[PDB]
Design an enzyme around this catalytic site. Structure first.
Site, PDB file in Angstrom:
ATOM      1  N   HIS A  52      -7.102 -33.819   3.363  1.00 45.95           N
ATOM      2  CA  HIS A  52      -6.751 -35.229   3.527  1.00 45.95           C
ATOM      3  C   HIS A  52      -5.237 -35.398   3.621  1.00 45.95           C
ATOM      4  CE1 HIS A  52     -10.825 -35.377   1.650  1.00 45.95           C
ATOM      5  NE2 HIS A  52     -10.996 -36.216   2.657  1.00 45.95           N
ATOM      6  N   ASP A  99      -6.044 -42.803   5.215  1.00 48.25           N
ATOM      7  CA  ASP A  99      -6.020 -41.950   4.026  1.00 48.25           C
ATOM      8  C   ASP A  99      -4.628 -41.824   3.406  1.00 48.25           C
ATOM      9  OD1 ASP A  99      -8.609 -41.260   3.441  1.00 48.25           O
ATOM     10  OD2 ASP A  99      -8.681 -39.556   4.819  1.00 48.25           O
ATOM     11  N   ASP A 157     -13.644 -40.686  11.542  1.00 52.96           N
ATOM     12  CA  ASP A 157     -13.239 -40.113  10.259  1.00 52.96           C
ATOM     13  C   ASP A 157     -13.908 -38.749  10.012  1.00 52.96           C
ATOM     14  OD1 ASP A 157     -12.171 -39.837   7.712  1.00 52.96           O
ATOM     15  OD2 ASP A 157     -13.369 -41.415   6.805  1.00 52.96           O
ATOM     16  N   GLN A 161     -23.120 -27.593   4.407  1.00 56.00           N
ATOM     17  CA  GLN A 161     -22.675 -28.149   5.675  1.00 56.00           C
ATOM     18  C   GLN A 161     -23.878 -28.744   6.387  1.00 56.00           C
ATOM     19  OE1 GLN A 161     -19.601 -28.623   5.208  1.00 56.00           O
ATOM     20  NE2 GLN A 161     -18.971 -28.033   7.276  1.00 56.00           N
TER      21      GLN A 161
HETATM   22  O1  LIG Z   1     -15.859 -34.404   5.389  1.00 55.10           O
HETATM   23  C1  LIG Z   1     -16.639 -34.099   4.489  1.00 55.10           C
HETATM   24  C2  LIG Z   1     -16.870 -35.044   3.297  1.00 55.10           C
HETATM   25  C3  LIG Z   1     -16.186 -36.251   3.206  1.00 55.10           C
HETATM   26  C4  LIG Z   1     -16.389 -37.076   2.104  1.00 55.10           C
HETATM   27  C5  LIG Z   1     -17.277 -36.693   1.104  1.00 55.10           C
HETATM   28  C6  LIG Z   1     -17.962 -35.487   1.202  1.00 55.10           C
HETATM   29  C7  LIG Z   1     -17.758 -34.658   2.300  1.00 55.10           C
HETATM   30  O2  LIG Z   1     -18.439 -33.410   2.380  1.00 55.10           O
HETATM   31  C8  LIG Z   1     -18.264 -32.492   3.454  1.00 55.10           C
HETATM   32  C9  LIG Z   1     -18.795 -31.222   3.633  1.00 55.10           C
HETATM   33  C10 LIG Z   1     -19.744 -30.484   2.669  1.00 55.10           C
HETATM   34  C11 LIG Z   1     -19.053 -29.238   2.087  1.00 55.10           C
HETATM   35  C12 LIG Z   1     -19.798 -28.093   1.826  1.00 55.10           C
HETATM   36  C13 LIG Z   1     -19.185 -26.974   1.272  1.00 55.10           C
HETATM   37  C14 LIG Z   1     -17.825 -26.997   0.984  1.00 55.10           C
HETATM   38  O3  LIG Z   1     -17.213 -25.880   0.509  1.00 55.10           O
HETATM   39  C15 LIG Z   1     -17.080 -28.143   1.242  1.00 55.10           C
HETATM   40  C16 LIG Z   1     -17.694 -29.262   1.792  1.00 55.10           C
HETATM   41  N1  LIG Z   1     -18.254 -30.711   4.863  1.00 55.10           N
HETATM   42  C17 LIG Z   1     -17.407 -31.756   5.375  1.00 55.10           C
HETATM   43  C18 LIG Z   1     -16.706 -31.680   6.562  1.00 55.10           C
HETATM   44  C19 LIG Z   1     -16.195 -32.698   7.252  1.00 55.10           C
HETATM   45  C20 LIG Z   1     -15.765 -32.316   8.685  1.00 55.10           C
HETATM   46  C21 LIG Z   1     -15.978 -31.036   8.983  1.00 55.10           C
HETATM   47  S1  LIG Z   1     -16.669 -30.319   7.601  1.00 55.10           S
HETATM   48  C22 LIG Z   1     -17.417 -32.771   4.511  1.00 55.10           C
HETATM   49 MG   LIG Z   2     -10.753 -41.605   2.992  1.00 57.67          MG
HETATM   50 ZN   LIG Z   3     -10.567 -39.719   6.096  1.00 57.17          ZN
END
Ligand SMILES: O=c1c2ccccc2oc2c(Cc3ccc(O)cc3)[nH]c(-c3cccs3)c12
Ligand SMILES: [Mg+2]
Ligand SMILES: [Zn+2]
Length: 299
Positions: free
Chosen positions: A79, A120, A220, A256
């Site tokens: 972020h 952000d 976003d 994911q």
């Molecule tokens: O952007 C988010 C997100 C935003 C707000 C709240 C929760 C979110 O969870 C997101 C994941 C799941 C995740 C799964 C494993 C990880 O090590 C980190 C994240 N991937 C993403 C990604 C976002 C874009 C490409 S990967 C997540």
């Molecule tokens: Mg935000």
């Molecule tokens: Zn954002």
């Protein structure tokens, strides 16, 4: 150095949108320097006719962009300015290549671009949510946005009449507040239901506002739609911020897929219905799900 950065930016020539690749949904910023992202940002305002229609002085827009960039924390893995920059690029792409521009007014487009870039501001990392659901974080982001917009020499909205100004600030505020996933989850049903029954109407003020919120969320989260190699890197950054507070990736794949199914797919599918030209976002999201799933099943 700051004044030096402004001088360099202000005096530089701004390449076309085509040359900067900002019209492509698959756009990546990894090879760009901060100065270059500032240039792409200027081109976004320019090609959306915002500089012209709202009489923005070059010097002011440049200073505003740098202030926005400066107010993100580089020590936060995901972020940060690059995330905001990418969110704005996706908005630009959705408006142009996605042909959504014609479906909105100039003030709405102006607010969307500013919101995307400012949504952000001053984020300190998901794990460092230190305070001093009414989306408290998003309210802070907006406050930062407003502060920058009102800073001397940074007033890019000085050309708007007071009425245009109040209308734009309101749209900007809602747009930023909409980036709170809790609000997205709470309002998406109505959006999905309307598209489902083919009753979606942008002429309806309530539906127009609802659409602007959904669009903000789409931009976003757009990292989830990028070409596999890019998406993996972005996921690596998110993982770093979430876990490394900046098993392991043996759980990332499934999470994911979980994220894609629970939050992303439906949104990009809905967006495509509103505008078939936004299909590439949905296509990219689907291709990444397949890739993550294969890994989850152990490759
Ligand atoms: O952007 C988010 C997100 C935003 C707000 C709240 C929760 C979110 O969870 C997101 C994941 C799941 C995740 C799964 C494993 C990880 O090590 C980190 C994240 N991937 C993403 C990604 C976002 C874009 C490409 S990967 C997540
Ligand atoms: Mg935000
Ligand atoms: Zn954002």
């Amino acid at each position: 150095e700051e004044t030096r950065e402004l001088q360099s930016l202000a005096a530089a020539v701004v390449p076309s949108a085509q040359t900067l690749k900002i019209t492509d949904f698959s756009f990546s910023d990894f090879e760009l320097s901060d100065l270059e992202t500032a240039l792409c940002t200027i081109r976004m305002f320019t090609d959306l006719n915002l500089v012209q229609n709202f009489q923005m002085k070059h010097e002011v827009l440049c200073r505003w962009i740098l202030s926005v960039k400066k107010n993100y924390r580089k020590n936060v893995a995901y972020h940060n300015w690059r995330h905001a920059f990418n969110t704005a690029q996706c908005m630009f792409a959705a408006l142009k290549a996605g042909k959504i521009q014609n479906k909105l007014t100039d003030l709405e487009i102006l607010a969307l671009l500013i919101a995307a870039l400012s949504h952000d501001l001053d984020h300190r990392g998901v794990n460092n949510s230190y305070i001093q659901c009414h989306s408290i974080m998003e309210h802070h982001h907006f406050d930062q946005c407003l502060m920058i917009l009102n800073s001397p020499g940074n007033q890019i909205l000085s050309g708007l009449s007071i009425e245009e100004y109040k209308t734009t600030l309101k749209i900007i505020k809602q747009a930023i507040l909409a980036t709170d996933l809790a609000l997205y989850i709470k309002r998406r049903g109505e959006f999905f239901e309307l598209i489902r029954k083919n009753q979606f109407n942008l002429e309806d003020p309530h539906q127009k506002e609802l659409f602007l919120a959904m669009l903000m969320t789409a931009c976003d989260l757009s990292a989830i739609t990028k070409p596999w190699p890019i998406q993996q890197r972005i996921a690596e950054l998110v993982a770093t911020e979430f876990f490394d507070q900046g098993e392991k990736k043996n759980k990332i794949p499934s999470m994911q897929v979980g994220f894609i199914d629970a939050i992303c797919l439906q949104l990009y599918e809905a967006l495509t219905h509103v505008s078939e030209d936004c299909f590439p976002l949905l296509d990219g999201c689907r291709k990444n799900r397949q890739k993550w799933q294969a890994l989850a099943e152990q490759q």
